[PDB]
Amino acid sequence: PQIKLVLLAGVGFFLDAYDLFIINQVAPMLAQVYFPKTGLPAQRQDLMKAAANIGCVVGQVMFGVLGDSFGRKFVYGKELILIIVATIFQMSAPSHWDGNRVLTWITICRVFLGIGIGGDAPMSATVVSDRANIHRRGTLLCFIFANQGWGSFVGSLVTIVTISGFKHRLKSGHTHDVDKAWRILIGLSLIPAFGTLYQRLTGVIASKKAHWQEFVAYFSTWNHFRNLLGSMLGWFLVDIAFYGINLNQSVVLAQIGFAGKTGDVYDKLFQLATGNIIVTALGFLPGYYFTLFLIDIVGRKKLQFMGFIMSGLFLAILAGEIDHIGKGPLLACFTFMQFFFNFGANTTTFIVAAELFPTRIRASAHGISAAAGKCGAILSSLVFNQLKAKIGTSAVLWIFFSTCILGFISTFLIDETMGVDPDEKDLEERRAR
């Protein structure tokens, strides 16, 4: 039936999300092995975590040109093999290498990993928005998007299970085994990756100039232009705070009480992995499902309004009190923030970008909106840890706070897409003139 296809898109997001966010769990292990006395260099750590998102935009533009040039039959399979190969090279960095050399190895591998993740990322949003043409299209988009939380959550679950498995061996003095652990975290993505591969198998310039003319003509009108503007802005702005935080979630939990001076190698990794699972299980994951049950009841805009404005509140509390109050209060606010990312702007910006635009342009308008988001992701990803040292963590959180208020303001540019057919609205718009 039609059902089996959306799960295949879902597991695509799950694998992409797992591979994207698992870098947050792998980074502290690389530190313990290759930089035990000092932290990971700021510029090098930022590059490694942005690498996947940098490739992510290169992927959907490259797989877009090839996909338009020679059709879909060309791109469907090869995107998944690229992230599989990138996983293996990333997995098998020579353990005898220098710390900086190992880092440079992983950054390059993750760029190619991003190129593949950039492939299936945008092509699945269209398969269920064009097919449904029903009021229950949002609940379908949100269900597939919810796999992003499972990717982040399963990665956190995998980490505590792995660390607790190395408990006795680490306590018995075999501290280098953490170098094996971080390779296991990346490698375990291969199990669904290989499973899905088997299931997936078992006048060009004149046309481009013509579509460009329609695109330019369409978005040269105000009431149509601002819908593209708000779609790009909302996605760009949320991804700054969203990916800046989620790719560095383990770094924030270090200002909070989860990083101490007591205890040995295991105690540190386990409590830090304990914090990561708490946040993603209690906040990051359920946010997708609160969005799921209310988008087709409350509407997309009101959820973006709430999503932007709620996560902003918790960002301001962090920045103001992070250096002044205890662990407990800070942890709760951080989890609430993550909750209102996915119960709010993060999920709705993805949905709104796919729901606003008539199909005759939807491929471009959604692609530019998704590209705009990845631009926000790479900005914070590329500079988060560098700013953290130059201006401090509180100052950086005040920046993310400002981006949320701007997202709230920009959301007014959007038409409510709950229950509206963008093709029918375009159709009635035209008969009236």
Q: What CATH number has the domain bearing residue 257?
A: 1.20.1250.20
Non-local CB neighbours of 247 within 8 Å, separated by 6+ positions? 20, 21, 23, 24, 49, 50, 53, 381, 384
Instruction: State the residue for tokens 């369409």.
Output: 218
Q: How was this structure determined?
A: X-ray
- Resolution in Å, one decimal place: 3.1
Q: How far apart are CA 375 and CA 367, in angstroms?
A: 12
Q: In this structure, are residues 116 and 82 in contact, taking their beta carbons and an 8 Å threshold? A: yes
Angle CA 423–426–432, to nearest 5: 140
Q: Which two tokens stand for residue 86?
A: 């990138």
Question: How many domains does the chain contain in total?
Answer: 1
Q: Give helix then strand counts, H and E, for the chain.
A: 20, 0
Longest dimension (CA), the chain: 79
Instruction: Report in angstroms the alpha-carbon separations of 116 from 37, 51, 85, 222, 229.
Output: 35, 12, 10, 36, 27
Q: In this structure, are residues 228 and 219 in contact, taking their beta carbons and an 8 Å threshold? A: yes
Q: For the purposes of burial, counting CB atoms within 10 Å of the CB of 25, is it exposed (0-12), middle (13-18) or buried (19 or more)?
A: buried
Domain that holds residue 144: 3-202+204-431
